[PDB]
Each structure stands twice: as structure tokens, then as C-alpha cells.
Amino acid sequence: RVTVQDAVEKIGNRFDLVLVAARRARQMQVGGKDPLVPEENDKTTVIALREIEEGLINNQILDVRERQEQQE
């Protein structure tokens, strides 16, 4: 998007933000994973950051979503 200052206040560290957004982008590319955000015509780079703008995607709650996919 325009700026990333709203997504960095939810996680803190900037390099932890790239790790959680890359794993969110891998699920949106190969294994489906339709996002909870309203889908627009932008690419998956902005969708990986728009989910952290309100705080529905974090580095702690993405690992429990990977284990939820492994149980199914």
C-alpha cells in the first residue's frame, strides 16, 4: 500500500513483519487461502500487508493456522 506504519505497530520489529507477510503470501499463491480483507485488483503484496493493518495476521497466530491446516 502507501505506508507500512500501521502494520509495524502491531508486530514491532520490521524484520518480523517480512517473515509473517512472506508466509501469508505463500498461502495465497499455492494453497488457496482467500483473505478476510475485501479483495481488490491489487497484487498479493498489498493483501499481505492489508491484513496486518487491522491486526488479523500476526507472527504468533500464523503458526497456529499452519498447524490447523496440518490437522485437516
Partner: protein, 188 residues
């Protein structure tokens, strides 16, 4: 749905190639890179749009960050391919979050020559100007005051402004050119 006929579609340059292209480059980060990088700000990412002419339109606000004027300097450009490298360009290498310099507390985004010159001609005080000593309802009315041409850009008037930190209002001595700035600055 192949690799052989897709090369023929690119080299033919028909109408359907550019509509595919603007979807890819709508929000793709692209690293603009000077060939001498003696500073950290020599590599900055951008979200480009498709234009005519084979030259890159490097932003003037980051022109002082590159420490390189538009003197005909030929310099590189780079893209990240994968999505874990594109997020490195948007969260770290973008020109939006590169405001402050790593060297000092002053920002590296400093208006150097022309945009500061347009700001300096507005923020000035002149006597015997067109429309000297008139009231204005707000800062947005100064755009109406200047574009019609009945008043000068620099005239000692009293404009109403709304300052924030919650909103306070006072009638202070403010010229016509400084009243253009109040619609530009944020609230706080």
C-alpha cells in the same frame, strides 16, 4: 498457455500486451539504483506506472536522498522477483518509510531547489499588494482568492485557520501564500 507462442505475443506488441502489463506493475515494487552508491539511500524501491520515453522518472523528494541531481546521470534499476523479496522492498526499501536519514536526526527528504522555491515565493510579505487587508473564511478560500487573479500570492491579510494537536481557532496575521499551506499540512 505455452512458452513458444507467448514470446511471439510480446515481440508483436499488440494491444492486449499493455493491459496485461498494467496489472503486473500496478503495485509491484521496483528498486531504483544509482551506479555509485556511497550512501544507504542509493537503492530505493518504487511502484512505477507505464509511461512513454525510455527514461525513469526518479522522484524529486528522494533526489536529495540519492545525492544525485538530474545532470544526465545514467543509473541502474532492479526488481525483486519472489514475494519474500518484494516485501523487503515495500517495508524497508520504499521511499515512503525512508524519510529520516540514518546519519542524523534531520530527514533525508529535503526540498532542494524548485519545490522549496515555490514554497518561498508563497510565504512572503508585501505591502501595496492586490487585495491587501481583506478577510478570508478559511485556508481553502485563498486558493479561490489567487486562481481568479484579483489578488496577489503575497498579501498581508487575516485568514481563519483551525489548528489541532481539540480544534482551536484564532485570527492571526497570515499572508495569502501561507494560507495555501494549511490545506497541505495535516491536522496535528
Amino acid at each position: 498457455t505455452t512458452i513458444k507462442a507467448a514470446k511471439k505475443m510480446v515481440e508483436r506488441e499488440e494491444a492486449v500486451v499493455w493491459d496485461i502489463l498494467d496489472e503486473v506493475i500496478r503495485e509491484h515494487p521496483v528498486l531504483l539504483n544509482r551506479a555509485p552508491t556511497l550512501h544507504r539511500l542509493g537503492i530505493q524501491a518504487f511502484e512505477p506506472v507505464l509511461i512513454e520515453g525510455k527514461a525513469i522518472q526518479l522522484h524529486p523528494l528522494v533526489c536529495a536522498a540519492y545525492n544525485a541531481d538530474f545532470d544526465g546521470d545514467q543509473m541502474a534499476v532492479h526488481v525483486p522477483l519472489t514475494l519474500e523479496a518484494q516485501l523487503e522492498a515495500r517495508a524497508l526499501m520504499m521511499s515512503t518509510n525512508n524519510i529520516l536519514s540514518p546519519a542524523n536526526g534531520e530527514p533525508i527528504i529535503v526540498p532542494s531547489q524548485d519545490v522549496v522555491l515555490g514554497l518561498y515565493y508563497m510565504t512572503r510579505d508585501c505591502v501595496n499588494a492586490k487585495g491587501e487587508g481583506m478577510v478570508l473564511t478559511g485556508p481553502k478560500e485563498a486558493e479561490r482568492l489567487y486562481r481568479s487573479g484579483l489578488a496577489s500570492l503575497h498579501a498581508r491579510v487575516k485568514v481563519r485557520i483551525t489548528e489541532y494537536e481539540v480544534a482551536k481557532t484564532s485570527l492571526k496575521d497570515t499572508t495569502v501564500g501561507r494560507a495555501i499551506l494549511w490545506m497541505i499540512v495535516p491536522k496535528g
